[PDB]
Amino acid sequence: AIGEFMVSLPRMVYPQPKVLTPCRKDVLVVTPWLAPIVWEGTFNIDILNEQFRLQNTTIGLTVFAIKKYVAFLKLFLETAEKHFMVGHRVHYYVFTDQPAAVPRVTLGTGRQLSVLEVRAYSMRRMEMISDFCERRFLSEVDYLVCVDVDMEFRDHVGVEILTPLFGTLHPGFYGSSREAFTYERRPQSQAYIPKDEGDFYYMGAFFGGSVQEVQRLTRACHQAMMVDQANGIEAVWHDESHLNKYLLRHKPTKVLSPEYLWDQQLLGWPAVLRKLRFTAVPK
Amino acid sequence: AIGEFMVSLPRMVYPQPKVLTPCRKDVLVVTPWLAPIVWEGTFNIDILNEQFRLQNTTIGLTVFAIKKYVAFLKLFLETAEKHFMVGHRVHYYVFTDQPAAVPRVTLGTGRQLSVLEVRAYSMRRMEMISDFCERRFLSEVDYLVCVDVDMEFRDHVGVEILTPLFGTLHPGFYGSSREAFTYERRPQSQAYIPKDEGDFYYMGAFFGGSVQEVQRLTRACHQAMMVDQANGIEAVWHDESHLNKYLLRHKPTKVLSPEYLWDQQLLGWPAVLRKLRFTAVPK
Ligand SMILES: O=c1ccn([C@@H]2O[C@H](COP(=O)(O)OP(=O)(O)O[C@H]3O[C@H](CO)[C@@H](O)[C@H](O)[C@H]3O)[C@@H](O)[C@H]2O)c(=O)[nH]1
Ligand SMILES: O=c1ccn([C@@H]2O[C@H](COP(=O)(O)OP(=O)(O)O[C@H]3O[C@H](CO)[C@@H](O)[C@H](O)[C@H]3O)[C@@H](O)[C@H]2O)c(=O)[nH]1
Ligand SMILES: [Mn+2]
Ligand SMILES: [Mn+2]
């Protein structure tokens, strides 16, 4: 459930948060619209796990594995079992054109996987999430997390991310000024963002929120992409360009740091990243 | 409205939030359960005003002025007009045993004041907010802000505070360790908090949230106070002790810094306070 009567937390023993000590002084930990930016050191996972377990929270995870990308599923799912929402109810939704190529992955208790067959041809994920699966998701999960498959979990990804709407800071651009962001810059596209606008550059590979907010986002992005197609224009970074436009105009209620979407081959392991949680696999 | 369909923000020009620059490095700006702590420099009020105006947000402000405390109403209300939620819809609810002693204060457009008569005898405010005014508030406002009257506004107090549930850091204790907090320490009281528990010491003089969450808090505190009365025990700091117990067990979704409740006579003007927003008046 979301937003239902919340019972009292039990007694807990943990370090006192000290008002005149920030943990993190090296990074921005709250946006100018008062959304937390989730970095290691900003959250006590024991408190958050209590809060979300007391709501019997169910998290849906969507992933698309079409054509050759079915090869990424084994590592993706096996590492999700080690690191993604462990202790909570999880429902994986694997969208594929090859149901027989989905690996048989052993799941922990309280976790389930559904294989959903789709047609083969990145930009049509918005349609599938919003048009075909709307009723399914509303009936089955509280939150949806939507990710790329060519990835692996290396460290904790848990309920600290959950909120009505979140995006993830793109690992390539978190230190960049907005003029350098690769937003869509042609006014003829629905994804257009002028050089004097923009908070962050969010990566299309990891977003989520409540089912209602994720359906709103994916519907809006799908509609905007259809308008662009009718006008003979394709945004520079496809669904990611539209996601960025949406999150500019509809501020996320949490922002995930690049701990949550990293490429170590391309970008190494900077001091500001205390953990690499969810990382690109080659190809 | 709260939680209803949110239209797109318009184009806005403002400084880019920079990920590798925190504004505030001198204070904790997010709790360990990922609630913002509201300090000057952490929010862009233009973004927040847009978000809340697009919901046509109405804020109720409750204040009690019983017996000699009617004398505080003129300054309280006149300064609220200068500083409290200016531009938003406001409904003041003034609870008094002397309706004729309520000063005639001129209000800005979109703002209204209701005088509610009560009996004369600090601890029964929880009952009035939760038992007598439940239906009224649900029909009339989106958020409730509940404050002491022996106060004045000196600077902006606006929609940055609004959230499902908030408390305010007590100005006397924000730098203190939890063992020094003046929580109720007798196990025989419903307000009891052991020396190894506690996040913050919240002041009873400024709390709020959505109408639903404020009714939950005030009902719980009223019930706990009734249990203590039946057991012949009175908590050390009365309603404030119970508020603290509630907010330990039900984490607030924002915490206000002591900018929002200050006593300059007793505590001066420390460097960590960039603004003194809402301050004690003598007596
Ligand atoms: O033949 C394909 C191609 C894509 N995918 C799916 O689509 C995702 C995105 O494609 P990918 O090749 O991973 O794109 P990237 O270049 O790694 O990522 C960029 O492109 C994506 C799609 O626009 C965005 O999600 C990312 O944010 C952006 O960095 C994949 O992970 C799969 O889940 C398939 O299943 N089969
Ligand atoms: O004769 C009275 C006494 C109290 N009040 C109301 O009750 C409030 C609280 O009383 P006050 O005298 O202001 O208490 P303080 O000692 O200033 O404040 C402490 O006591 C309050 C009541 O327990 C808590 O709200 C505060 O957090 C705590 O710091 C007042 O502001 C009024 O709104 C009256 O209207 N008439
Ligand atoms: Mn990818
Ligand atoms: Mn007072």
Residue of A nearest to B27 (CA): A20
Alpha helices, DSSP H, located in chain B: 45-54, 73-83, 125-127, 134-140, 211-230, 239-249, 264-267
Cα A30 to Cα A234, A276, B59, B94, B112: the distances in Å are: 33, 20, 24, 35, 34
Q: From the DSSP assignment, how many helices (H) and strands (E) are in chain B?
A: 7, 10
How far apart are alpha carbons B21 and A224 in whole angstroms? 33
How far apart are alpha carbons B43 and B20 in whole angstroms? 17
B53, B87 contact by CB (below 8 A): yes
3-state SS class at B202: strand
Whether B242 has a binding-site annotation, put simply, is no
**Tokens standing for residue A152:** 């692996």
Whether B30 has a binding-site annotation, put simply, is no
Whether B173 has a binding-site annotation, put simply, is no
Whether B260 has a binding-site annotation, put simply, is no
Contact A43 B34 (CB under 8 A): yes
Cα B137 to Cα A165, B54, B60, B129: the distances in Å are: 28, 21, 8, 9
* CA R_g for chain A: 19
Pocket test for ligand 2, best of B73, B122, B228 (most atoms within 8 A of CB): B122
- Which resolution in angstroms does this entry have? 1.4
Of A122, A168, A124, the residue nearest A145 (C-alpha) = A168
Backbone φ and ψ of A78, nearest 5°: -65, -35
| Element of type H or E holding B1 | none
- DSSP helix, strand, coil percent of chain B (3-state; round to 5): 30, 20, 50
How far apart are alpha carbons B83 and B165 in whole angstroms? 21
User: What is the whole-number distance in angstroms between the Cα of residue A238 and the centre of ligand 3?
Assistant: 13
Q: Of A127, A213, A240, A259, which is the active-site residue?
A: A240
**Tokens standing for residue A276:** 């690499």
User: What is the whole-number distance in angstroms between the Cα of residue B206 and the centre of ligand 4?
Assistant: 10
Q: Whose CA is nearest to atom 18 of ligand 2?
A: B205
Q: Is residue A204 lining ligand 1, measured as CB closer than 6 Å?
A: yes
How far apart are alpha carbons B211 and A258 in whole angstroms? 36
SS3 string, A13-47, reads: CCCCCCCCCCCCCCCCCECCCCCEEECCCCCCHHH
Q: Of B127, B184, B240, B259, which is the active-site residue?
A: B240
- DSSP helix, strand, coil percent of chain A (3-state; round to 5): 30, 20, 50
CA A197 to chain CA mean position, Å: 23
> B240 catalytic, yes or no?
yes
Residue of A nearest to B48 (CA): A33
How far apart are alpha carbons B186 and B238 in whole angstroms? 13
Cα A274 to Cα A40, A156, A257, B18: the distances in Å are: 6, 12, 11, 19
**Tokens standing for residue A189:** 């596209």
Buried (b) or exposed (e) across B187-216, using 16+ Cβ within 10 A? eebbbbbeeebbbbbbbbbbbbbbbbbbbb
How far apart are alpha carbons B121 and B271 in whole angstroms? 41
**Tokens standing for residue B63:** 């204040």
What domain range includes position A45?
1-283
How far apart are alpha carbons A93 and A96 in whole angstroms? 10
Backbone φ and ψ of A93, nearest 5°: -120, 105
Cα A82 to Cα A123, A152, B18, B260, B277: the distances in Å are: 29, 10, 33, 44, 48
Residues of A whose CB is below 8 A from B31: 17
How far apart are alpha carbons B73 and B267 in whole angstroms? 24
Contact B16 A175 (CB under 8 A): no
Of B136, B108, B137, the residue nearest B214 (C-alpha) = B137
Determine the angle formed by the axes of helices B239-249 and B211-230, rounding to 10 degrees.
120
Token look-up 């700091």 returns B237
One DSSP character per residue, A166-203 reads EEEB-TTTTTS-GGGS-----TTSTT---TT--S--B-
**Tokens standing for residue A204:** 């299309």
Q: What is the Cβ-side half-sphere exposure of residue A136, based on CA atoms within 13 angstroms?
A: 15
> In the β-sheet with B143-147, what is the strand arrangement from edge to edge?
B37-38, B254-256, B165-168, B206-210, B143-147, B58-65, B89-96, B111-117
Long-range contact pairs involving B51-54 (C-beta distance under 8 Å, separation at least 24) = B51/A33, B51/A251, B51/B6, B51/B9, B51/B159, B52/B88, B52/B159, B52/B162, B53/B87, B53/B88, B54/B6, B54/B7, B54/B9
User: What is the whole-number distance in angstroms between the Cα of residue B173 and the centre of ligand 4?
Assistant: 16
Task: For residue A28, give the nearest of B21, B169, B194 by CB distance.
Answer: B21
Give bridge partners of residue B168 from the DSSP assignment: B256
The pairing of beta strand B111-117 with beta strand B165-168: unpaired
3-state SS class at B217: helix
Positive or negative CA dihedral for A221, A223, A225, A231? Answer: negative
Contact A34 B11 (CB under 8 A): no
Contact A174 B20 (CB under 8 A): yes
How far apart are alpha carbons A8 and B250 in whole angstroms? 6
3-state SS class at B207: strand
Work out the burial of residue B100: count CB atoms within 10 Å of its CB; fewer than 13 is exposed, 13-18 middle, 19 or more buried. Answer: exposed
Question: In sequence order, which residues have a C-beta less than 8 Å from that of residue A84 and are 6 or more positions away?
Answer: A61, A90, A153, A157, A158
Residues of B whose CB is below 8 A from A16: 177-178, 198-199
Backbone φ and ψ of A177, nearest 5°: -85, 155
Cα A243 to Cα A28, A132, A184, A197, B218: the distances in Å are: 22, 19, 11, 15, 41
One DSSP character per residue, A148-165 reads -SSEEE-S-B-GGG-SSE
A63, A139 contact by CB (below 8 A): no
| Element of type H or E holding B8 | none
Question: In sequence order, which residues have a C-beta less than 8 Å from that of residue B270 and are 6 or more positions away?
Answer: none
A52, A4 contact by CB (below 8 A): no
Token look-up 């948060």 returns A17
Task: Give chain B's domain count.
Answer: 1
User: What is the whole-number distance in angstroms between the Cα of residue A150 and the centre of ligand 1?
Assistant: 8
Token look-up 């009617």 returns B70
Give bridge partners of residue A145 from the DSSP assignment: A61, A208
How far apart are alpha carbons B267 and A193 in whole angstroms? 47
Q: Is residue A98 lining ligand 1, measured as CB closer than 6 Å?
A: no
B266, A26 contact by CB (below 8 A): no
- CATH label of the domain that carries residue A231: 3.90.550.10
A255, A37 contact by CB (below 8 A): yes
How far apart are alpha carbons A144 and A162 in whole angstroms? 9
Q: Is residue B278 lining ligand 2, measured as CB closer than 6 Å?
A: no
Q: Is residue A94 lining ligand 1, measured as CB closer than 6 Å?
A: no
Contact B33 A11 (CB under 8 A): no
| Element of type H or E holding B107 | none
Give bridge partners of residue A117 from the DSSP assignment: A96
B130, B215 contact by CB (below 8 A): yes
How far apart are alpha carbons B196 and B179 in whole angstroms? 7
**Tokens standing for residue A157:** 């990804």
Positive or negative CA dihedral for B71, B75, B78, B83? Answer: negative
How far apart are alpha carbons A201 and A177 in whole angstroms? 10
Instruction: Please state how this structure was obtained.
Output: X-ray
Buried (b) or exposed (e) across A235-259, using 16+ Cβ within 10 A? bebbbbbbbbbbbbbbbbbbbbbbb
Residue of A nearest to B181 (CA): A16
Whether B182 has a binding-site annotation, put simply, is yes
For the CA of B237, the closest atom of ligand 2 is: 23
Q: Taking the CB of residue A25, how many other CB atoms lie within 10 A of it? A: 11
How far apart are alpha carbons A59 and A85 in whole angstroms? 8
Token look-up 């002025």 returns B65
Question: In sequence order, which residues have a C-beta less than 8 Å from that of residue A109 and are 6 or more positions away?
Answer: none
How far apart are alpha carbons A218 and A216 in whole angstroms? 6
How far apart are alpha carbons B47 and A248 in whole angstroms? 11
Token look-up 């989106």 returns B142
One DSSP character per residue, B32-97 reads TTS-BEE-TTS--HHHHHHHHHHTT-EEEEEEEE-GGGGGGHHHHHHHHHHHBSTTSEEEEEEEES
Q: How far is B34 from chain A (nearest CA, A)?
A: 6
Q: Whose CA is nearest to atom 28 of ligand 1?
A: A204
B57, B142 contact by CB (below 8 A): yes
Question: In sequence order, which residues have a C-beta less than 8 Å from that of residue A124 and are 6 or more positions away?
Answer: none
Contact B200 A169 (CB under 8 A): no
Determine the angle formed by the axes of helices A211-230 and A239-249, rounding to 10 degrees.
120
Contact A13 B43 (CB under 8 A): no
Q: How far is A198 from chain B (nearest CA, A)?
A: 7
Q: Is residue A67 lining ligand 1, measured as CB closer than 6 Å?
A: yes
Residue of A nearest to B22 (CA): A28
**Tokens standing for residue A228:** 């662009």
Question: In sequence order, which residues have a C-beta less than 8 Å from that of residue B16 and are 6 or more positions away?
Answer: A177, A178, A198, A199
Residues of A whose CB is below 8 A from B48: 33-34
